[PDB]
Amino acid sequence: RPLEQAVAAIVCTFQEYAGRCGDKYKLCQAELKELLQKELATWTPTEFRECDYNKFMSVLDTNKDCEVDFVEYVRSLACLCLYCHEYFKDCPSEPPC
Template identity: 45%
Template sequence: MSKQTSEKPCDPPSTLEMAIGGLIQVFHSYSGKEGDKYKLNNGELKNLLQGELCGFMTGSNDPKAVEKIMADLDENKDGEVDFQEFVLMVAALTVACNEFFTGYTRGEEKEKAPCPKKA
């Protein structure tokens, strides 16, 4: 006897599915403007960080912040950030925010928030 399952597509997509789609859309909306369409060069990364993560960037007074981020992200040292390297950055930021807010809800004091607070 076989089991019958009623698999139907998620409509609307789940929050996580939307987040995954958003990551892909954001990356590709900035990549390839000046070169390889599947990678971000330094200028494209700067535009992405300023346009999409401005809450993280506004706390930095370091004029070389983007260059430092690029150096950290560019694991294969090709001078560009591919999608996998970009996702690793987003994952690291997400972990840092989770750790901050987990500590915040427990009443632990934090000197500086690693992620922007909602107003």
């Protein structure tokens, strides 16, 4: 159930931000950035993922399109794990991402 609760919570957060206004199935990059920075504030990159992390977060600043769907939102979460979670420290898999 732990994964059930976790996945339910990831959809909850998406609904919170996407449901603000307009298309309830889409986010702007700015909303996605805000989401990540506020909901995952304590998450910071690991040793060899610092540069990858920064480029990722700058892209969310630069890019200002609003076609971010749920799948892309979740992908961003995955990317943050590869950058900030110690388990993936030595992962020779350069962020997809």
